[PDB]
Enzyme design. Structure first.
Site, short mmCIF file in Angstrom:
data_model
loop_
_atom_site.label_atom_id
_atom_site.label_comp_id
_atom_site.label_asym_id
_atom_site.label_seq_id
_atom_site.Cartn_x
_atom_site.Cartn_y
_atom_site.Cartn_z
N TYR A 1 5.91 19.53 -7.40
CA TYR A 1 5.49 20.38 -8.51
C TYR A 1 6.29 19.99 -9.76
CZ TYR A 1 3.15 22.79 -4.66
OH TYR A 1 2.36 23.06 -3.57
N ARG B 1 15.10 25.29 -4.59
CA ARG B 1 14.54 24.40 -3.58
C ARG B 1 14.35 23.04 -4.21
NH1 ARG B 1 9.99 25.97 1.09
NH2 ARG B 1 11.32 25.08 2.72
N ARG C 1 6.14 29.30 9.50
CA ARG C 1 4.86 29.48 10.19
C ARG C 1 4.98 30.40 11.40
NH1 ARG C 1 3.53 23.26 10.58
NH2 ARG C 1 5.82 23.34 10.45
C1 FMN Z 1 0.98 28.98 4.14
C2 FMN Z 1 2.20 28.29 3.64
C3 FMN Z 1 2.62 28.57 2.35
C4 FMN Z 1 3.77 27.96 1.86
N1 FMN Z 1 4.16 28.25 0.58
C5 FMN Z 1 5.30 27.69 0.07
C6 FMN Z 1 5.70 28.02 -1.21
O1 FMN Z 1 5.06 28.86 -1.85
N2 FMN Z 1 6.84 27.45 -1.73
C7 FMN Z 1 7.57 26.55 -0.96
O2 FMN Z 1 8.59 26.03 -1.41
N3 FMN Z 1 7.16 26.22 0.33
C8 FMN Z 1 6.03 26.79 0.84
N4 FMN Z 1 5.63 26.46 2.12
C9 FMN Z 1 6.47 25.55 2.96
C10 FMN Z 1 7.32 26.52 3.80
O3 FMN Z 1 8.19 27.29 2.99
C11 FMN Z 1 8.09 25.84 4.92
O4 FMN Z 1 8.93 24.85 4.36
C12 FMN Z 1 7.15 25.21 5.94
O5 FMN Z 1 6.23 26.16 6.43
C13 FMN Z 1 7.93 24.57 7.10
O6 FMN Z 1 8.70 25.53 7.79
P1 FMN Z 1 8.18 25.99 9.25
O7 FMN Z 1 8.16 24.80 10.17
O8 FMN Z 1 9.13 27.05 9.75
O9 FMN Z 1 6.80 26.53 9.03
C14 FMN Z 1 4.50 27.07 2.64
C15 FMN Z 1 4.06 26.78 3.94
C16 FMN Z 1 2.91 27.39 4.42
C17 FMN Z 1 2.43 27.10 5.82
C1 O8R Z 2 2.03 19.08 1.45
O1 O8R Z 2 2.89 19.85 0.65
C2 O8R Z 2 3.94 20.44 1.35
C3 O8R Z 2 4.97 20.96 0.36
O2 O8R Z 2 4.39 21.93 -0.47
C4 O8R Z 2 4.51 23.24 -0.01
O3 O8R Z 2 5.04 23.48 1.03
C5 O8R Z 2 3.91 24.34 -0.86
N1 O8R Z 2 4.54 24.89 -1.79
O4 O8R Z 2 5.85 24.51 -2.07
C6 O8R Z 2 2.48 24.75 -0.58
C7 O8R Z 2 1.94 25.99 -1.27
O5 O8R Z 2 1.83 24.10 0.17
C1 O8R Z 3 0.38 23.55 10.27
O1 O8R Z 3 -0.47 23.58 9.16
C2 O8R Z 3 -0.83 22.32 8.66
C3 O8R Z 3 0.11 21.95 7.52
O2 O8R Z 3 1.22 22.79 7.57
C4 O8R Z 3 2.34 22.36 6.89
O3 O8R Z 3 2.95 21.40 7.24
C5 O8R Z 3 2.75 23.16 5.67
N1 O8R Z 3 3.62 24.05 5.76
O4 O8R Z 3 4.22 24.29 7.00
C6 O8R Z 3 2.07 22.87 4.34
C7 O8R Z 3 2.30 23.81 3.16
O5 O8R Z 3 1.36 21.93 4.23
#
Ligand code: FMN
Ligand code: O8R
Ligand code: O8R
Ligand code: FMN
Ligand code: O8R
Ligand code: O8R
Ligand code: O8R
Ligand code: O8R
Lengths: 360, 360
Positions: free
Chosen positions: B182, B230, B325
């Site tokens: 971003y 971040r 997640r």
């Molecule tokens: C639905 C969704 C929305 C997310 N939104 C953000 C976000 O708004 N800002 C951000 O820095 N990361 C965002 N992420 C990345 C997560 O904060 C996180 O790094 C990612 O889900 C991996 O962690 P996990 O394996 O515990 O899911 C998002 C991920 C998911 C799946």
């Molecule tokens: C493929 O992009 C993964 C990194 O970006 C994010 O996790 C995110 N926001 O920071 C969203 C809303 O997806």
């Molecule tokens: C498991 O969902 C498929 C992709 O999930 C991701 O890796 C993710 N966040 O966890 C993003 C924002 O892309």
């Protein structure tokens, strides 16, 4: 998977066979629900269950179990449920409500605050009522006031008024709480009903309060929305065969009185029992009620694993599986069950902001 | 269990080391959050996590990723977060917020609605801005407009205004979104920043937008509340050793500029990468940043099992484990983790109306 087949009863269609049974939260104040309930119910509904029956809601102030119980004894109480009803619906679940009167078990502390009858020196307590001036015993020693015929007329009208309020709030499913040793159960049981008038003694007399309350509610509850009740069909008190036969006959008369579905439970009318807790132990009992009374049923008390729930439906023991405590542990339990049972696109048990990511 | 030890940073104490990282819900309208977010955040906070960082919240309308992204670009937008802040605190969790600007990845469809840039003929879209007029590529082909000096001043002031609003709304923890390709990440990366003025070229110049934004936010954000960011510290683009070294040097300058904690992530600045997804794969990278820049860190992307989270803390790779997640799957994941790790009275990770019954 049978657990994820839809179910239609009257005009209501549930998206699966997972029901969240009524579970008191003990978080209301003067009967009014609040943000505890709003989030609690909305989150579980988003979890995927097809039906969410809101906790025992008192038809009169003295019918609460505890000072934390929800009530629906005024129009203001009913209006407080409208955002809960609408949030359950918005999640794609069906909103139901259990309306209740705690009888001799009323005026009790919250379970994590002693779980016992409130002391007579405590400003929160109140006089309890029951078929007969006989105490439950054990942790509930307070002797209730024996109801008069006027009391019986009034409590019946309170159930009617509560059903009408629940209808107007938008609930699509009602459950009369005739189980668990509260007022309705205690009229049926010879343990607690020693009356010598038309409401005690014979089977017809002990059934009378429950049948008359059902019939009075039936007048105001819409014919096109499920009218159900919860009833304890045995006590595990050494009288199980005779009690279950009588309970099944009452279920036949509930059906003749327009009941659409029976939630089959245990009586809990007295403490001197030996309930054989175990996985799905109610399965065979619910099956017998279903088959002999020819009425759809749900039950609970140990069906809370995906395989046990599935097995009970495949065996035609239940029409809906009620899963309570597992939804307190995980408000998305229905999604967990869909995953375990290998439902295709199991993540879409949940709304898109979750489903998209849990599909991968 | 290290996962359930408290953590203190500035005047804020988290009840455990479980953090819910920002997760976009794509459910807002014109930047305003609504009942989706209210229940979503309140339920997860009741689940037991010590810190809940609210999703990427745009500092300006064109800084949204999608038409469903939350915003905080007016006082009315900020006031809409107050009930979310209140609900997170009421659950005993600490409310944080990530403030953000999507840069060249803005004006995109929701992930379950194509996940690509909105077409130029689609009136839902908008012109994007970035350090240089160069597209991400792949599913995000839209070429951004290169920012003017006035644009840079304006976006910095938007971050200040957003931090001011987050402060006044009661957030106790702020995270500047300098990661994931971003706006902020794209100023640092040579892939996306081809500027020839003070904001591009040298390491000092590429760092300038991020350091100046941090300093400007520092003026309005309280000294006694954690100021965090971040930041993607490598891309897996074949330049990892040199990129990581520069990123750690920038983290040192963040520390000198008052940063209290760094959420260590991947850059995602360009699509032509080879990210080695796997369990806890960021552990060693987060540990190196933590040790070399002498800053507390969190990370994510595969720590979402109780044992992986516990292992990362005991190895001093992380100070907080971000679990994303798994909390969408189970809003009560913190309770699930307490049970698996054998925490005493694990059920009391949850509030009493759940904990009493799950203790049995
Ligand atoms: C639905 C969704 C929305 C997310 N939104 C953000 C976000 O708004 N800002 C951000 O820095 N990361 C965002 N992420 C990345 C997560 O904060 C996180 O790094 C990612 O889900 C991996 O962690 P996990 O394996 O515990 O899911 C998002 C991920 C998911 C799946
Ligand atoms: C493929 O992009 C993964 C990194 O970006 C994010 O996790 C995110 N926001 O920071 C969203 C809303 O997806
Ligand atoms: C498991 O969902 C498929 C992709 O999930 C991701 O890796 C993710 N966040 O966890 C993003 C924002 O892309
Ligand atoms: C916290 C809690 C509250 C309950 N409240 C009610 C209630 O209000 N009315 C009722 O009929 N049963 C109530 N029950 C009994 C449940 O509906 C259900 O029968 C019981 O939890 C067993 O099902 P399970 O094994 O899936 O938990 C409650 C149970 C719990 C744990
Ligand atoms: C404000 O959203 C209330 C709940 O909404 C949902 O759960 C949902 N989609 O998000 C559907 C289609 O059921
Ligand atoms: C030992 O009692 C078990 C049966 O009673 C119930 O399940 C109940 N309400 O019906 C509550 C609030 O506990
Ligand atoms: C004592 O329970 C701890 C959890 O916090 C609450 O009680 C609550 N919301 O979290 C409300 C609005 O009642
Ligand atoms: C919850 O764990 C302890 C066992 O208590 C119960 O079985 C119960 N409901 O499930 C009630 C209302 O008593």
């Amino acid at each position: 998977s049978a657990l994820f087949e839809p179910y239609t009863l009257k005009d209501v269609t549930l998206r699966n066979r997972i029901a969240i049974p009524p579970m008191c939260q003990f978080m209301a104040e003067d009967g009014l629900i609040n943000d505890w309930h709003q989030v609690h119910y909305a989150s579980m509904a988003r979890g995927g269950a097809g039906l969410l029956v809101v906790e025992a809601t008192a038809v009169a102030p003295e019918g609460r179990i505890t000072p934390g119980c929800a009530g629906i004894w005024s129009d203001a109480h009913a209006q407080a449920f409208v955002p809960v009803v609408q949030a359950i619906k918005a999640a794609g679940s069906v909103p139901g409500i259990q309306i209740a009167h705690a009888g001799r078990k009323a005026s009790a502390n919250r379970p994590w605050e002693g779980d016992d009858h409130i002391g007579a020196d405590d400003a929160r307590g109140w006089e309890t009522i029951a078929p007969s001036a006989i105490a439950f015993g054990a942790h509930l020693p307070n002797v209730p006031r024996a109801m008069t015929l006027d009391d019986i007329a009034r409590v019946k009208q309170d159930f009617v008024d509560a059903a009408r309020r629940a209808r107007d709030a938008g609930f699509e499913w009602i459950e009369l709480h005739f189980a668990h040793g509260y007022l309705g159960q205690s009229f049926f049981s010879e343990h607690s009903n020693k009356r010598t008038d038309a409401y005690g003694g014979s089977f017809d007399n002990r059934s009378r309060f429950l049948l008359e309350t059902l019939a009075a509610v039936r007048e105001v509850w819409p014919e096109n929305l499920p009218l159900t009740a919860r009833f304890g069909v045995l006590e595990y008190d050494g009288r199980d065969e005779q009690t279950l036969e009588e309970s099944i006959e009452l279920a036949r008369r509930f059906k003749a009185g327009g009941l659409d579905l029976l939630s089959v439970s245990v009586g809990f009318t007295i403490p001197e029992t030996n309930i054989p807790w175990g996985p799905a132990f109610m399965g065979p009992i619910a099956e017998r009620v279903r088959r002999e009374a020819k009425l759809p049923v749900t039950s609970a008390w140990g069906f809370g694993t995906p395989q046990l729930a599935e097995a009970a439906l495949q065996a035609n023991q239940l029409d809906l599986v009620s899963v309570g405590r597992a939804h307190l542990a995980d408000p998305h339990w229905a999604y967990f069950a869909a995953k375990e049972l290998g439902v295709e696109k199991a993540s879409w048990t949940l709304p898109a902001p979750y489903a998209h990511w849990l599909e991968r």
